[PDB]
Amino acid sequence: MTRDQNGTWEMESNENFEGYMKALDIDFATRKIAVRLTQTKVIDQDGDNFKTKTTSTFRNYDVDFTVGVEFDEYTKSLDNRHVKALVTWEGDVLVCVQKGEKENRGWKQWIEGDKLYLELTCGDQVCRQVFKKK
Ligand SMILES: CCCCC/C=C\C/C=C\C/C=C\C/C=C\CCCCOC(CO)CO
């Protein structure tokens, strides 16, 4: 019964963000700035309907979805790719597959304790982020 991810979440760790960005072909100059940043994530969730806003001083990225409903996603101001995205529940873990030109691209997001965990995958690279609730 930990599917409720509502809140404002502040990043406390960001492991292998460098490798994940390189797997997405982010250029070096962009990576050099992006790797330093503390991200904030605001999740507005009504059951299976999610509105998410991820913010930083350098980039912001918003995505809304309903669990179980495939949608077109354009990762504007990140890697700027078009994918078909589907978010599902595996237990109380939110799982996203982003089908497109990059193999094995997706993410998983879940609550444990008072922390939000987010694992981002692209190819053979996994980035592990942890956020603390504000
Ligand atoms: C926006 C703040 C970015 C700062 C770095 C700026 C530029 C790096 C370019 C590309 C990095 C690719 C991706 C960025 C990582 C996570 C974004 C959010 C993706 C996961 O969020 C999901 C909902 O959306 C689940 O919560």
XYZ file of C-alpha atoms and ligand atoms in Angstrom, residues 17 20-21 24 26 30 34-35 37 39 41 43 52 54-56 58-63 65 73 77-79 105 107 109 116 118 120 129, ligand 1:
60
model
C 23.969 10.102 -14.058
C 23.203 7.399 -18.301
C 23.560 10.766 -20.070
C 21.653 9.031 -24.403
C 24.181 14.037 -24.420
C 25.639 19.710 -21.471
C 23.783 18.667 -15.747
C 25.826 16.317 -13.565
C 22.603 19.828 -10.334
C 16.906 18.062 -8.991
C 10.510 16.414 -8.413
C 4.413 14.515 -8.146
C 5.137 15.119 -12.753
C 11.184 17.678 -12.546
C 13.100 20.919 -12.094
C 16.628 22.280 -11.878
C 19.386 24.389 -15.994
C 16.467 22.321 -17.365
C 12.898 21.492 -16.429
C 10.896 18.519 -17.682
C 7.173 17.824 -17.259
C 5.376 14.589 -18.122
C 0.476 9.954 -17.806
C 6.575 11.167 -25.163
C 15.219 19.754 -23.505
C 16.661 16.432 -22.307
C 17.791 14.219 -25.219
C 15.257 2.545 -22.111
C 12.697 3.849 -15.500
C 10.138 4.646 -9.331
C 11.579 8.144 -3.339
C 14.196 6.355 -9.198
C 16.776 5.265 -14.979
C 18.548 8.531 -7.771
C 14.780 17.900 -15.582
C 16.060 18.064 -14.792
C 17.229 17.529 -15.634
C 18.602 18.074 -15.222
C 19.672 17.503 -16.238
C 19.668 18.328 -17.585
C 19.993 17.786 -18.787
C 20.396 16.308 -18.947
C 19.947 15.824 -20.358
C 19.425 14.577 -20.476
C 19.297 13.702 -19.205
C 18.105 12.740 -19.382
C 17.170 12.654 -18.441
C 17.278 13.542 -17.155
C 17.079 12.685 -15.903
C 15.889 12.707 -15.246
C 14.757 13.587 -15.769
C 13.410 12.996 -15.305
C 13.237 11.594 -15.926
C 12.541 10.653 -14.870
O 11.361 11.293 -14.353
C 10.207 10.493 -14.535
C 9.038 11.417 -14.883
O 9.468 12.207 -15.990
C 9.969 9.679 -13.257
O 9.862 10.569 -12.172
